[PDB]
């Protein structure tokens, strides 16, 4: 039994526990069980993996999982999503720096605790449902089958405190005929470290994250698959997940209610530039283990299906040009309690009731 605990502004206290065994019983397969829990999510999985599906090193992996997501505890407009499902994945090493993945998946989603609101109800209508704008207690359940694909490039010089190279991760998903939902979703993440000096003590880091998904035919992508932005890992200085569209609630039993409750969206773009330098005023020998950075972060999340014509007087959440921006300082080092990172950032471009969070940290 391997345990772990962490603490941060993004998810509060995180617990992790798991067991793993390669070459179980001399069969050649690895078997694992692991779980994680934080302020808004409980996740558990069982895994079986053959690292030599072919002699060449193609791996075949299987996953059985359960997940419990509480949207309001993740700083979104409220809902509960209890899910479970399976995945079978083929993994291809291309060379030492590149890997490819292709897999098939099943997922069951059970949605509840949804208050009537424009974007969610719009998705339900696209699914052929006719919920009333005063329905407080509906549940929605779906069974989806997917094709999943991925590509990872990693040529960073080292895992901890990188100074040179790039990492790129592309991940995509599309539903298979027979699913309830019909949609696709693609994500791209990049990070590139460019050292200035031969010593690699001064480094420029550029990061990007892109995301796009949409429904097929008349259907929309499910809102419980939306992208988010804001927080320690995307746009610092903003509360986790606050960036982008906000829920518009229907009157109880009048007019609509604007809120500041983030709902995410089906399109997202985030970029960051930061200047990694030696740490001033520090004692000698601490310097190599303590990394200071000055950053400029920026990001947007938007809703390509927002019908601006129907909601006159409300913000146009389909507009992709409301780019949030912040600047600030970060410090990172290894402590007795594990990896330590914190930042002070000031948002200087905000929109649509985004919530600020200047001081953000993570331990573990």
């Amino acid at each position: 039994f391997n345990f772990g605990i962490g603490y941060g502004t993004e998810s509060g206290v995180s617990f992790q526990a798991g067991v793993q065994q390669d070459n179980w019983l001399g069969t050649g397969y690895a078997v694992g069980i692991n779980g994680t829990k934080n302020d808004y999510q409980t996740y558990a999985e069982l895994s079986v993996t053959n690292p030599y599906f072919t002699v060449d090193g193609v791996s075949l992996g299987g996953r059985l999982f359960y997940n419990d997501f509480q949207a309001d505890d993740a700083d979104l407009s409220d809902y509960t999503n209890k899910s479970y499902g399976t995945d079978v994945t083929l993994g291809f090493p291309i060379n030492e720096y590149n890997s490819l993945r292709a897999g098939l998946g099943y997922v069951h989603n059970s949605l509840s605790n949804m208050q009537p609101q424009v974007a969610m109800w719009r998705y339900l209508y696209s699914m052929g449902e006719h919920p009333s704008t005063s329905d407080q207690d509906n549940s929605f359940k779906t069974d989806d089958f997917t094709f999943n694909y991925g590509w990872t490039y990693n040529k960073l010089d080292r895992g901890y405190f990188p100074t040179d190279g790039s990492r790129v991760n592309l991940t995509g998903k599309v539903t298979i005929p027979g699913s309830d939902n019909e949609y696709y979703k693609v994500t791209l993440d990049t990070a590139t470290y460019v050292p200035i000096d031969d010593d690699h003590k001064w480094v420029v880091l550029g990061r990007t994250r892109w995301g796009y998904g949409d429904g097929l035919g008349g259907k929309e992508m499910p809102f419980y698959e939306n992208f988010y932005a804001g927080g320690s890992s995307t746009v610092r200085g903003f509360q986790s997940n606050t960036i982008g569209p906000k829920a518009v609630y229907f009157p109880h039993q009048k007019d609509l209610s604007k809120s500041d409750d983030a709902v995410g969206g089906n399109a997202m773009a985030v970029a960051s530039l930061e200047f990694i330098t030696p740490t001033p005023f520090i004692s000698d020998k601490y310097a190599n283990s303590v990394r200071t950075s000055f950053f400029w972060d920026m990001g947007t999340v938007w809703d390509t299906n927002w019908d601006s014509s129907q909601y006159s007087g409300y913000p146009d959440y389909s507009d992709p040009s409301n780019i949030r921006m912040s600047a600030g300082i970060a410090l990172q080092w290894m402590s007795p309690l594990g990896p330590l990172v914190f930042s002070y950032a000031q948002p200087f471009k905000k929109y649509d009731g985004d919530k600020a969070e200047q001081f953000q940290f993570n331990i573990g």
């Epitope: 339900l124 449902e129 919920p131 009333s132 509906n138 549940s139 779906t142 309830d180």
Partner: nanobody, 122 residues
Framework: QMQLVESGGGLVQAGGSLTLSCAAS????????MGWFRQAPGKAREFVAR????????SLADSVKGRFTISRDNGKRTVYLQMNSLKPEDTAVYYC???????????????WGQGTRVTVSA
């Protein structure tokens, strides 16, 4: 004219469970939102649960939240009521109902079954 026939009602002990079924005649079952209602002796009929044409959307009365579940099988032209953790207050005749409209089927319907009786003893 579509007919609805409920079955599954019986005598059950408090804490036990039961599954009701409602079978529909004809080939138009998927055209209808479906509902379960119940009527205790001396009282008016009352809403219990409903389910959309597709089977994906459901809702439940407050008195059965967390205990009852509604589902349907459009291939078998059947809607089900799964009743767990039963109490003596659940004793009643249970009726199946069908209506073209989701919002209406919470209070009434175009088509009604003849009911199936459930008795929960303490």
């Amino acid at each position: 004219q579509m007919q609805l026939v409920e079955s599954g009602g019986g005598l059950v002990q408090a804490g036990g469970s039961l599954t009701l079924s409602c079978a529909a005649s004809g080939r138009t079952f998927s055209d209808y939102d479906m509902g379960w209602f119940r009527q205790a002796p001396g009282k008016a009929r009352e809403f219990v649960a409903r389910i959309s044409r597709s089977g994906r959307m459901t809702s439940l009365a407050d008195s059965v939240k967390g205990r009852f579940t509604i589902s349907r099988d459009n291939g078998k032209r059947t809607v089900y009521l799964q009743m767990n953790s039963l109490k003596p207050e659940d004793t009643a005749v249970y009726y199946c109902a069908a209506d073209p409209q989701w919002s209406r089927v919470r209070s009434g319907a175009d088509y009604w079954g003849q009911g199936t009786r459930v008795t929960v003893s303490a």
